[PDB]
């Protein structure tokens, strides 16, 4: 007929095509309709940040300090550590001379923070460290916040850039800017899980953070031969700032008086997710290529994370590649050409019964995250296997109990790149100039039940 | 009147601000509350990968092969294919001489996998091809997994980087690494939809895959003039390997015996999404500036995806731009400056009644994906229209069936760049050195109903 | 300024300051008396302001130009400070303390 751009007579033709299939799909007296949103009232509350008072010593590199959780709140649901890094000034009297650069290690945060623990009175609840932090961040980070996260945890292409001596071309100094590390805890996992501070007047809530020595937090790299040696006080200007200054911030949530009176004086049961780290095992690809490690876990495991870490140098961390990074052109750091994950294949065995056969490393690397996660890692390593449909979902999903399960093992196979990197003899700026050593780490995430009654906490199932 | 340590006075002040608006929004006896997550038990089950047993033929490039779905499982909800690419090495005896390079085509996966179908005995239920795979990947890609999916399909700066002859300065060879292609089916779209293998003891389920010859997968480019010629066995070393290592894996999920007996012998009704492609039409912008294409579809159409493909060379694929890609500086491929989508405008017509006017190409390119899609494409082309609020939502919504609809047509308009690039005359490294050819492809996603009864499946409507 | 400096302390305090500055104003007969005396509440009262006029000596000493051993050799900066002392009520019951009004 006619078209004007503002008429809607065309939609009637589409509407008139109401056949049997459309009748089955849509329509009906009880059928809901769009363009109408049901509104239901929610609770009346208020949130605000809150200071956390330190109780054990003062922050310092290589030392452990404790902070109590502030009371007089109703629900605590956030926690983050803010730390002001010191200023680094390289000196001309370095042991490496002109061919020497100093730079911050990759992932400064998730480093210098190990055995971060939460305790009720004198009963430990959970703890985590660098491996769990790295795996969880690489596997369950929502896109869009990646820039913010890798700008707040370091990795800003400014602290990780090698800096030559004062007498060389690169005289830039590493800036001293504060960094923020959120602390992944069970109450911080979801809003529905919050610590009932009002309901818990007897248990004392404590957080224990152990820092790391500044010696292993700085990478001292040779520009030419690509060799790493530990840093010393005389190598940098101003000495080593052993003491560091930091805070712990948490967010509390106030609730209405009627709600608190109604909910005060009752028993509650909550489901939480913990961490279990298997003891590290040294792997030597020169002798053997197949390594079997026994796994000993207790509760319903939800996922298994593992990787092989280049443990040759303590200064460099979060290196899950057979070859260490080396200095590159333009005062930058770049990975050598031969830089691949040492793991080739893996399998799981339950009391001499392989539940999962010898699948390829690419399977765990890509296929499993594509289906049972919210993100895919952008770095080599971090091989995972999840028994659940959604790892990030706090609601329970498929899992296998390990308490009633007989002893099980995981078998891994090395790679020709790993076995050739284990032997030294690499040329300059190749990373594998010196012999390399590797270690195997296994992390497990399991469910648990916590009961709150009579103003106290505990694990009924242990 | 203080703010020291823990602060609750500010929270009390904030809570005191209660008025009519706050009373209407929050509060009430029936109002829900946060910090308290309701817990409801779910079913007990387990899942594990399972190999799929080939029944017909051998996996080789250029023909058809089918794999049966393993029985004895309880639910099948995931399927993917693994394929190891061969090793390619250039030879000095190439026809093009020094001015000649060989590289893998862009998007190696989704290519050489055409007419991939799922068959119930001898009745088809779902079939997809390269165009549908590309459109779905570009329009429904969750962020964070984009890099992982890209690495799975290739494009890792090694497959797509041209390699010169051995005698020249650059003599690198294309590595041989396995790649994984997930299979998007109705049961793989959502966890709620899965094949009840226990309920289907008599039906036979097959997955049929057609491969393509390596001639159409390998791109042989001229270094200077940017011309592409078909490859021959004598050009490269090793020869054309017809056979290839490739397998199909699927994930099965066991369930508790308590519920399988209860659900045995019951009628199941499901909704599924299927794809249907209009036949391709050759478009010559030199003779005409507008193209009319008739659509003939059956069921409730969800969306239409259309794009004009540069089909000048069968060697190069997944190219929807008026100018073919050419070799660039630095031993890499660079897209020429003249690179725009040939379509300038598009419109729909219902029995000579214009439902959708001559809207701009940028509308379909950006505005429609912004409002009714989960992602926006990062490449030129892939225009789409949607009849529903959410394309990726499994639940049905706004959709008009074409069974009762009369003949419908789509009108597309070329561009001055397309009409000038259709003829040749371009200089070296310009893309349109040789005359170009274009084709139009239309993809429609529709709904259908699947009924399960008496250990068999049929179409109630058909 | 001499009013606040001398007259108010002479009548409503136990001492008079011996240093420059320290200007005060009390709504009560005795500043140091623990027992309540004349006072007004600012919670019900609307916004109140205090306006202070500077001095020619201050405006000439704010800039530099002073010679040696003059104090105002360098440019000078000043800041205004206001302190208020008020009353409140504390309730002790049930083995705890709090403000019934706050």
């Amino acid at each position: 007929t006619c078209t004007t751009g503002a008429g809607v007579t065309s939609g009637f033709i589409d509407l008139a095509t109401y056949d049997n299939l459309d009748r089955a799909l849509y329509g009906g007296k009880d059928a809901t309709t769009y363009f109408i949103k049901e509104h239901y009232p929610v609770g009346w509350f208020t949130k605000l940040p809150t200071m956390a008072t330190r109780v054990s010593g003062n922050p310092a590199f290589g030392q452990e300090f404790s902070v109590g959780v502030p009371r007089s709140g109703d629900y605590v649901l956030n926690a983050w550590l803010t730390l002001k890094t010191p200023e680094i000034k390289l000196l001309e009297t370095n042991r490496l001379g002109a061919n020497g650069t100093v730079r911050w290690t990759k992932n400064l945060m998730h480093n210098a923070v190990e055995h971060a623990s939460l305790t009720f009175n004198d009963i430990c609840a959970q703890q985590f460290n660098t491996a769990y932090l790295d795996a969880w961040t690489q596997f369950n980070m929502c896109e869009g916040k990646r820039i913010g996260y890798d700008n707040m945890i370091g990795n800003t292409s400014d602290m990780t850039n090698p800096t030559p001596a004062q007498g060389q071309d690169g005289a830039r100094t590493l800036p001293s800017k504060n960094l923020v590390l959120p602390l992944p805890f069970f109450f911080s996992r979801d809003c529905g899980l919050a610590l009932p501070t009002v309901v818990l007047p007897y248990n004392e809530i404590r957080i224990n953070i152990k820092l790391r020595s500044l010696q292993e937090l700085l990478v001292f790299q040779n520009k030419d031969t690509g060799n790493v040696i530990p840093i010393s006080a005389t190598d940098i200007a101003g000495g080593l700032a052993d003491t560091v200054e930091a805070y712990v911030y948490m967010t509390v949530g106030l609730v209405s008086n009627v709600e608190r009176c109604a909910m005060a004086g009752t028993v509650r049961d909550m489901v939480v997710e913990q961490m279990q780290a298997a003891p590290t095992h040294i792997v030597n690809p020169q002798n053997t290529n197949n390594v079997h490690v026994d796994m000993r876990f207790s509760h319903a495991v939800k996922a298994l994370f593992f990787m092989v870490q280049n443990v040759t140098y303590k200064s460099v961390g979060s290196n899950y590649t057979c070859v260490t990074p080396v200095n590159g052109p333009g005062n930058t750091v770049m990975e050598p050409a031969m830089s691949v994950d040492p793991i080739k294949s893996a399998s799981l065995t339950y009391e001499n019964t392989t539940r999962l056969a010898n699948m390829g490393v690419e399977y765990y690397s890509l296929v499993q995250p594509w289906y049972f996660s919210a993100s895919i890692p952008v770095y080599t390593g971090y091989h995972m296997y999840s028994y659940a449909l959604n790892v990030g979902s706090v609601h329970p999903s498929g899992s296998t109990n390990y308490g009633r399960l007989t002893n099980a093992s995981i078998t891994v196979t090395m790679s020709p790149e790993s076995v050739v990197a284990a032997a030294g003899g690499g040329n300059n700026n190749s990373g594998y100039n010196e012999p390399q050593r590797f270690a195997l780490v296994v992390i497990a995430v399991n469910h648990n039940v916590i009961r709150i009654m009579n103003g106290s906490m505990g694990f009924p199932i242990l | 009147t203080c703010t020291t340590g823990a602060g609750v006075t500010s929270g009390f002040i904030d809570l005191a601000t209660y008025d009519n608006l706050d009373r209407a929004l929050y509060g009430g006896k029936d109002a829900t509350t946060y910090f308290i997550k309701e817990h409801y038990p779910v079913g007990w089950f387990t899942k594990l990968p399972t190999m799929a047993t080939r029944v017909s033929g051998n996996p080789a490039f250029g023909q058809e092969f089918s794999v049966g779905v393993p029985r004895s499982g309880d639910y099948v909800l995931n399927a993917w294919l693994t394929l190891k690419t061969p090793e390619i090495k250039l030879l000095e005896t190439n026809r093009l001489g020094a001015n000649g390079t060989v590289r893998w085509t862009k998007n190696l996966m989704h290519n050489a996998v055409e007419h991939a179908s799922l068959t119930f005995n001898d009745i088809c239920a779902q079939q997809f091809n390269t165009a549908y795979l590309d459109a779905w990947t570009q329009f429904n890609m969750c962020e964070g997994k984009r890099i992982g999916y890209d690495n799975m399909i290739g494009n890792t700066s090694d497959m797509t980087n041209p390699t010169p002859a051995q005698g020249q300065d650059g003599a690198r060879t294309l590595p041989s690494k396995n790649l994984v292609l997930p299979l998007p089916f109705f049961f793989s779209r959502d966890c709620g939809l899965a094949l009840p293998t226990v309920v289907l003891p008599y039906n036979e389920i097959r997955i049929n895959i057609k491969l393509r010859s390596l001639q159409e997968l390998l791109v042989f480019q001229n270094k200077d003039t940017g011309n592409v010629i078909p490859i021959s066995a004598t050009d490269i070393a090793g020869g054309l390997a017809d056979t290839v290592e490739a397998y199909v894996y699927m994930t099965v999920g066991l369930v508790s015996n308590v519920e399988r007996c209860a659900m045995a012998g019951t009628v199941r009704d499901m909704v599924v999404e299927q794809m249907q492609a209009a036949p391709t039409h050759i478009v010559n912008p030199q003779n005409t500036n507008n193209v009319h294409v008739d659509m003939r579809f059956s069921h409730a159409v969800k969306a239409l995806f259309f794009m004009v493909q540069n089909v000048t060379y069968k060697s190069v694929g997944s190219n929807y731009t008026c100018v073919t890609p050419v070799n660039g500086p630095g031993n890499t491929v660079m897209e020429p400056a003249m690179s725009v989508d040939p379509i300038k405008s598009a419109s729909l017509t219902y029995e000579n009644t214009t439902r959708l006017a001559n809207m701009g190409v940028e509308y379909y390119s950006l505005v429609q994906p912004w409002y009714f899609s989960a992602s926006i494409p990062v490449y030129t082309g892939y225009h789409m229209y949607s009849y529903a609020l959410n394309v990726g939502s499994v639940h049905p919504s706004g959709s008009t069936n074409y069974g009762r609809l009369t003949n419908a047509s789509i009108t597309v308009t070329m561009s001055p760049e397309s009409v000038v690039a259709a003829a040749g005359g371009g200089n070296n490294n310009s893309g349109y050195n040789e005359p170009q050819r274009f084709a139009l492809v239309v993809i429609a996603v529709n709904h259908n109903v699947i009924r399960i009864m008496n250990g068999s499946m049929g179409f109630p409507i058909l | 300024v001499e009013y606040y400096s001398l007259v108010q302390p002479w009548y409503f305090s136990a001492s008079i300051p011996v240093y420059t500055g320290y200007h005060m104003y009390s709504y009560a007969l005795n500043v140091g008396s623990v027992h309540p005396s004349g006072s007004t509440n600012y919670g019900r009262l609307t916004n109140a302001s205090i306006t202070v006029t500077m001095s020619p000596e201050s405006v000439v000493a704010a800039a530099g130009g002073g010679n040696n051993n003059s104090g105002y050799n360098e440019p000078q900066r000043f800041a205004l400070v206001v302190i208020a002392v008020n009353h409140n009520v504390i309730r002790i019951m049930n083995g705890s303390m709090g403000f019934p009004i706050l």
Binding site: Y202, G455, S456, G458 | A16 | -
Partner: peptide, 29 residues
Amino acid sequence: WEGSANPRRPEQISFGMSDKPKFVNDKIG
């Protein structure tokens, strides 16, 4: 203008311990 009212009453800080619950049915197996 009235300014409303909002008292602050801290809700208890106990220094004792009524009874310590014990752990039963361990997952050690």
